[PDB]
């Protein structure tokens, strides 16, 4: 189906102690593949996936050069916003940026995006047309006018339609053995008595990729997902994901309940019940 290349920047000021802490992380779909952390004597862009290790020194030097320059602009940006908002230097502040491209199965662009924050709130965002900006407050309006004058939207449009899509295709081919093959969930129903009268039935989905999944419960062939407790999809730690959904049932009535699992890896959606 659809695929994405995405980057996430975070900068956190450190009052009275030196330069801001800057973190950059890159993702292809749900898989992280690059990192940068400013907290090192000589920090570099680094691999976080086996399939990107192949890239030569040229690649790593260019990414490192770009990320280090970005870290410096984020440092000046934090200082600039202290002036815009008339805020004390003594208090810590933070700025985030996330951007990326979503493509169709054949490789063609579906959408490009870019957004900036300040202290956990929307600051400025590139519009859908990739030609204009939406500013969230009067400080962001200063930035907006500045970026309009500089022709910033054109550079983003060039990157998102060009470099972003092209390199995503390269990444997908480089790691086709992992990125392009869906990993089906291992599924089971477990039983946990609460008392002689009540019992918890928990439906497990383990070790799946990608993260998107649907867990639903039925009773007597009727939907009762509204009664279930569903945990947020969580990382297993090895690049796969986990999720469960549980219902409290009357003891003796467990055969009336069915858990249904839908995931991209499954040729057929599975329905399970307590054995």
């Amino acid at each position: 189906g659809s695929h994405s290349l995405r980057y996430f920047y975070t900068a956190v000021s450190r009052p009275g102690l030196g330069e801001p802490r800057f973190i950059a992380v890159g993702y292809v779909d749900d898989t992280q593949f690059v990192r940068f952390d400013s907290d090192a004597p000589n920090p570099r862009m680094e691999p976080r996936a086996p399939w990107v290790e192949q890239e030569g020194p040229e690649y790593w030097d260019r990414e490192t050069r770009k990320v280090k320059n970005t870290a410096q602009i984020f440092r000046v940006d934090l200082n600039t916003l202290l002036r815009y908002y008339n805020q004390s230097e003594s208090g810590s502040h933070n700025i985030q940026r996330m951007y990326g491209c979503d493509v169709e199965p054949d490789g063609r662009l579906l959408r490009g995006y870019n957004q900036d924050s300040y202290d956990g709130k929307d600051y400025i965002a590139l519009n859908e047309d990739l030609r204009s900006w939406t500013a969230a407050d009067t400080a962001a309006q200063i930035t907006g006018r500045k970026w309009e004058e500089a022709g910033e939207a054109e550079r983003w449009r060039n990157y998102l339609q060009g470099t972003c899509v092209e390199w995503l295709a390269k990444y997908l081919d480089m790691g086709k053995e992992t990125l392009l093959r869906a990993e089906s969930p291992n599924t089971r129903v477990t039983r946990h008595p609460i008392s002689d009268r009540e019992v918890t039935l928990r439906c497990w989905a383990l070790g799946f990729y990608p993260a998107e999944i649907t867990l639903t419960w039925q009773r007597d062939g009727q939907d009762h997902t509204q009664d279930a407790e569903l945990v947020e999809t969580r990382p297993a730690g090895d690049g796969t994901f986990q999720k469960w959904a549980a219902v409290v049932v009357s003891s003796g009535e467990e055969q009336r309940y069915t858990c249904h699992v839908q995931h991209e890896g499954l040729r057929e959606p599975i329905t399970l019940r307590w054995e």
């Binding site: 260019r62 990414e63 770009k66 970005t70 970026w147 910033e152």
Partner: peptide
């Protein structure tokens, strides 16, 4: 590949 360094806010 990332985008190149942005213009200041």
């Amino acid at each position: 590949r990332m985008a190149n360094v942005s213009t200041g806010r």
